[PDB]
Design an enzyme around this catalytic site. Sequence first.
Site, PDB file in Angstrom:
ATOM      1  N   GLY B 158      20.944  80.807  69.734  1.00 30.67           N
ATOM      2  CA  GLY B 158      20.820  81.532  70.987  1.00 30.67           C
ATOM      3  C   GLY B 158      21.635  80.932  72.122  1.00 30.67           C
ATOM      4  N   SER B 209      21.607  73.327  75.615  1.00 29.08           N
ATOM      5  CA  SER B 209      20.497  72.894  74.765  1.00 29.08           C
ATOM      6  C   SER B 209      19.243  72.556  75.581  1.00 29.08           C
ATOM      7  CB  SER B 209      20.915  71.668  73.951  1.00 29.08           C
ATOM      8  OG  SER B 209      19.818  71.135  73.228  1.00 29.08           O
ATOM      9  N   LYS B 210      18.165  73.312  75.371  1.00 32.57           N
ATOM     10  CA  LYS B 210      16.897  73.098  76.077  1.00 32.57           C
ATOM     11  C   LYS B 210      16.458  71.639  76.108  1.00 32.57           C
ATOM     12  CE  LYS B 210      14.246  77.445  75.543  1.00 32.57           C
ATOM     13  NZ  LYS B 210      15.092  78.304  74.671  1.00 32.57           N
ATOM     14  N   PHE B 212      18.009  69.187  74.596  1.00 35.09           N
ATOM     15  CA  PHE B 212      19.187  68.339  74.625  1.00 35.09           C
ATOM     16  C   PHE B 212      19.095  67.322  73.484  1.00 35.09           C
ATOM     17  CE2 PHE B 212      22.674  66.154  76.966  1.00 35.09           C
ATOM     18  CZ  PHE B 212      23.376  67.297  77.345  1.00 35.09           C
ATOM     19  N   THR B 214      19.097  68.869  70.150  1.00 37.09           N
ATOM     20  CA  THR B 214      19.560  69.682  69.030  1.00 37.09           C
ATOM     21  C   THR B 214      20.672  68.892  68.336  1.00 37.09           C
ATOM     22  OG1 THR B 214      19.153  71.635  70.409  1.00 37.09           O
ATOM     23  CG2 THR B 214      20.391  71.955  68.370  1.00 37.09           C
ATOM     24  N   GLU B 216      23.168  69.481  65.968  1.00 41.57           N
ATOM     25  CA  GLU B 216      24.529  69.998  65.944  1.00 41.57           C
ATOM     26  C   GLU B 216      25.182  69.988  67.319  1.00 41.57           C
ATOM     27  OE1 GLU B 216      22.948  72.820  62.408  1.00 41.57           O
ATOM     28  OE2 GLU B 216      22.194  72.458  64.443  1.00 41.57           O
ATOM     29  N   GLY B 271      15.484  81.431  72.848  1.00 47.28           N
ATOM     30  CA  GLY B 271      16.912  81.259  72.647  1.00 47.28           C
ATOM     31  C   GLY B 271      17.672  82.553  72.409  1.00 47.28           C
ATOM     32  N   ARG B 272      17.159  83.389  71.511  1.00 50.83           N
ATOM     33  CA  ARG B 272      17.819  84.653  71.194  1.00 50.83           C
ATOM     34  C   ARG B 272      17.681  85.711  72.288  1.00 50.83           C
ATOM     35  NH1 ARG B 272      13.679  83.552  67.954  1.00 50.83           N
ATOM     36  NH2 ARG B 272      11.812  84.881  67.999  1.00 50.83           N
ATOM     37  N   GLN B 353      20.929  88.205  64.712  1.00 46.02           N
ATOM     38  CA  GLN B 353      20.051  87.107  65.102  1.00 46.02           C
ATOM     39  C   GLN B 353      18.849  87.615  65.901  1.00 46.02           C
ATOM     40  OE1 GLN B 353      19.760  82.953  67.700  1.00 46.02           O
ATOM     41  NE2 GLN B 353      21.730  84.015  67.557  1.00 46.02           N
ATOM     42  N   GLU B 357      15.714  87.115  63.498  1.00 50.01           N
ATOM     43  CA  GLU B 357      14.980  85.903  63.845  1.00 50.01           C
ATOM     44  C   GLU B 357      13.657  86.279  64.514  1.00 50.01           C
ATOM     45  OE1 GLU B 357      15.774  81.556  66.048  1.00 50.01           O
ATOM     46  OE2 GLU B 357      16.978  83.310  66.554  1.00 50.01           O
ATOM     47  N   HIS B 388      36.882 101.295  57.190  1.00 51.84           N
ATOM     48  CA  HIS B 388      37.858 101.176  56.104  1.00 51.84           C
ATOM     49  C   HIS B 388      37.522 100.020  55.172  1.00 51.84           C
ATOM     50  CE1 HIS B 388      40.332 104.221  57.896  1.00 51.84           C
ATOM     51  NE2 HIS B 388      40.383 103.555  59.036  1.00 51.84           N
ATOM     52  N   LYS B 518      15.171  71.970  58.258  1.00 53.75           N
ATOM     53  CA  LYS B 518      15.567  70.846  59.099  1.00 53.75           C
ATOM     54  C   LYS B 518      14.978  69.533  58.607  1.00 53.75           C
ATOM     55  CE  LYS B 518      16.613  73.002  63.565  1.00 53.75           C
ATOM     56  NZ  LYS B 518      16.246  73.091  65.006  1.00 53.75           N
TER      57      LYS B 518
END
Lengths: 556, 556
Positions: B158, B209-210, B212, B214, B216, B271-272, B353, B357, B388, B518
């Site tokens: 998100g 990042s909420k 901070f 996360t 990745e 997030g989403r 998402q 989600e 196509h 995770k």
Amino acid sequence: AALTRNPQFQKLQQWHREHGSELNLRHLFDTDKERFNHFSLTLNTNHGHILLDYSKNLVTEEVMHMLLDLAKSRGVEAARESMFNGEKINSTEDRAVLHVALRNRSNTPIVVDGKDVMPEVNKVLDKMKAFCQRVRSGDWKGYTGKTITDVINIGIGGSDLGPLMVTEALKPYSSGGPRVWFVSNIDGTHIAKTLACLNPESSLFIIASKTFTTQETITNAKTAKDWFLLSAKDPSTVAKHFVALSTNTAKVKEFGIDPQNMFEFWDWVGGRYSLWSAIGLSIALHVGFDNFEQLLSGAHWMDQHFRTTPLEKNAPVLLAMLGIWYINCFGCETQAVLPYDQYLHRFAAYFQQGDMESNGKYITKSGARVDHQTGPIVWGEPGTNGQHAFYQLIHQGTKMIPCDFLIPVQTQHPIRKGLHHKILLANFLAQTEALMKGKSTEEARKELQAAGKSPEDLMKLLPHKVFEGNRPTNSIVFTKLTPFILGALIAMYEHKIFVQGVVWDINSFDQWGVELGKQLAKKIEPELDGSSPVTSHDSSTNGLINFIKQQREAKI
Amino acid sequence: AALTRNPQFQKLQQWHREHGSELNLRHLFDTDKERFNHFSLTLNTNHGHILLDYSKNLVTEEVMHMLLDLAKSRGVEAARESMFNGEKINSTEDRAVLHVALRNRSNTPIVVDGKDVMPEVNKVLDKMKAFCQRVRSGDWKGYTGKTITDVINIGIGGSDLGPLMVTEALKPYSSGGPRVWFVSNIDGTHIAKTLACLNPESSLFIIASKTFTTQETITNAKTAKDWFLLSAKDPSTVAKHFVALSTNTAKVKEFGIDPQNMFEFWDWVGGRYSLWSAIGLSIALHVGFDNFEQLLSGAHWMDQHFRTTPLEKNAPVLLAMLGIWYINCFGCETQAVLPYDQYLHRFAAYFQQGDMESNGKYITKSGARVDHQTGPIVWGEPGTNGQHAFYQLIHQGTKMIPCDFLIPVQTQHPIRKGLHHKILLANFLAQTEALMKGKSTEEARKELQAAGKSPEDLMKLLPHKVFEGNRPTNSIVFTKLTPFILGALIAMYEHKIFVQGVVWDINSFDQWGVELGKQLAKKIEPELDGSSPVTSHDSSTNGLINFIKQQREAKI
């Protein structure tokens, strides 16, 4: 229809009806230490290894045996030979199906209409390399005398997706090549935003169209010519900035292109299987011909694997039959493709066409209507991206979704001493493990208990934290994503698609589903002109057209 | 599960049972000239019109009444009020769901925990505008005194897709704005190829990042900082090139970011559903704050429409119930989203998402396991491209696939005097018309004869040329894709998602499905170090890890 009347199919169905829902991955692994060894295959191509681990699937030795029997009784082997031998297996259009000839590095004769096609295949390839050399080396010049810095491929469907996906996937191998762009949508936004970033003096356009009369492609090509000429002025300079991937000499020459610069392919080259032909010119221009030949060699290697390997250990056959298992027995509508590689970000989209346009059929080769499911809906996003978007539904939704997880052992960018790739690999592994293992109610209760949750708060959240698991996946791991390995992977899925088509007895190589929309579009085009209301269609189409006429003037 | 026990639902299912497969679109239109009028909705936002034509759906007035009765008996209206009033409807996490507060232009008080949230919402927006003004104007300088030319958003899920999809969709409104980049995948390739095109003295990084924490995002952030400092060298300069969209002041300050450059959002912002908050900073920087406020106003307009419109003429409710009809009665696993607009090329991915989600759940709010289907698999590519690629299967496959076709009447690039858009519109219209009408055996036969096909050629081709039609679609047409209209469209689908969740009695706003994967990944990471084999997992996970270790240093 054949499949439903096939003895092996019925036996499979009967078995699934009785034991299907009883299969449990966690239980299968817990009671068989050799499961990985017995349900996986490692392939050494001499240019990297490819591990196809299909052990996390809902199958037993018995199920695989039954699936292989079905493949045999459906004549998969005889069908394969017919394709490789140049027979006209494309029954509705009465044409051969020879993308395998395009990459036939062995140059073994393949006769069609009493003539070997290899000489013509190699003639175009040599022609492609010669041209590529002139452009890349700088020998080829723009009407102003400058070297080409940007190459723009204009085409739709199979004349776009393959070149785009491959150049995106092999970006690290484009050292010394011009930048490549891809215009496909008829939506004016596409060509307009693309042209705004280019200098006509050093831009080379590649018009990809067999007939050279494809509406969207030719319209875009003509718009690009106008844009060019707005600067160049002279119509004669077009021959220096436009080349064609086609066979219609007249239309190409009429466009202002030199027939000498027309790279051809044949009718036995399906659009969705054409990146290996002249259509791959933008690829060769971007990564060089040596890398392009590596791409072809990879596909050739896989072609040989498919043709000479016993079914029991044949990669494409195994993937195909596992798919048949989930589609015709479990009734799963979709197939997810999740590459843990940013370079392969358009890999799933490529096979959306390759798989869906090939097997989204309902009439058998005998003209009978199928009474069973055929091609699935292919979708996905590169991991870990997609992993943070829709995996929620894969893990805890109400749909069974076969997933193919792919990843290269070695990254093209080992930054931070390999830290990023290490985390990527861990997630690749942990996700399929999680989908298989899940987390039981008791397991989740213990975690909640340990988290100091009150009986009330625990009960309220508990079921939501349970993962039922038993979600099947294939893990495909390869040493490194090189031109050769990519070629092998694409060819592998091309053959998976081929095998399923045979089992379903459909023609995977025609695409009649395209004409209806096309004919109706040509009828509507002239009706859009003017402000008079249209009443010649159904009330919906009429209503939409009239809303469009009413609003096209609206000043927001 | 509540839905299955609902009398309005059972009545709907019995009807389907008894009449379902009898519904034929072509026959419905042929026998009712008021069909379009009866099954279409036109919305005048005063800033453009939105036509929701849902007449090409397998429904009758009787079916729509039963669907609307179900929406009412399932308490959609009361649930909507609970959301808008700040009640903690996110039951498993005990939190409010207030993305609607983020765009509450009317500033009507919305109380959470005895305190109006609007003041803090507006405070952050003002802070965002102030910061943007400094950056855009060139007031904000890098450590060497140069203006910012590039903005790089680093985030996943998100914190990535929304900003990316919107900036892509509103490119025409970005004049005078810095270039925006989006880094999300942990795959090192993503940050590496981005950093290779940047100048550290004119690049501004936004770490979204909420918490901070996360993995990745923080890993990508650290890599970007190391890259920056290689040139800057002085740690104190980080505060001039890195800002954060978070609430963890400690971690942000620790990273080297000035806490005054931390833009906050709240736990009631999923997030989403966060592009409307500080997460949309990259959007504001790219298109300016006036346009960002237009985006918010569009969503606010749709919010009002959803809250004040009787169910029978309520856009999101209608879309939601038609979906329920296909999901729970026809058993369709997927929902295709096909926008005929290149700018909206990431629109379908965004909702893949937002929808999956949110509604990819199997436990109801009462803790019961659902005994019915929930969220569908969302997928698609922008028209003509997608047209196509995989439409062959939509037209002649063996799956029913509800499709939402979307398109602006007015294009942002009316090149060639509108020729491109005219063709795009004709195809948008013709495709839904063809899916509805199809082409009978006799119609195809007549065409083949007129084409001069021989008797046996006609006989072999005939069945393959037949289109069974009766494939349902929604056509959503809007005056022009402006920031306001885009906001309205996104909000419209957010509410479609909300309504379906209410009907299914699931919590559309949690995402517990993320935990298991995770936790397993964190356990595998350290096991990848070293060349010693791993045997602590199931044989598949073990085998995959050992192949990786072996191939790690294989030289290709």
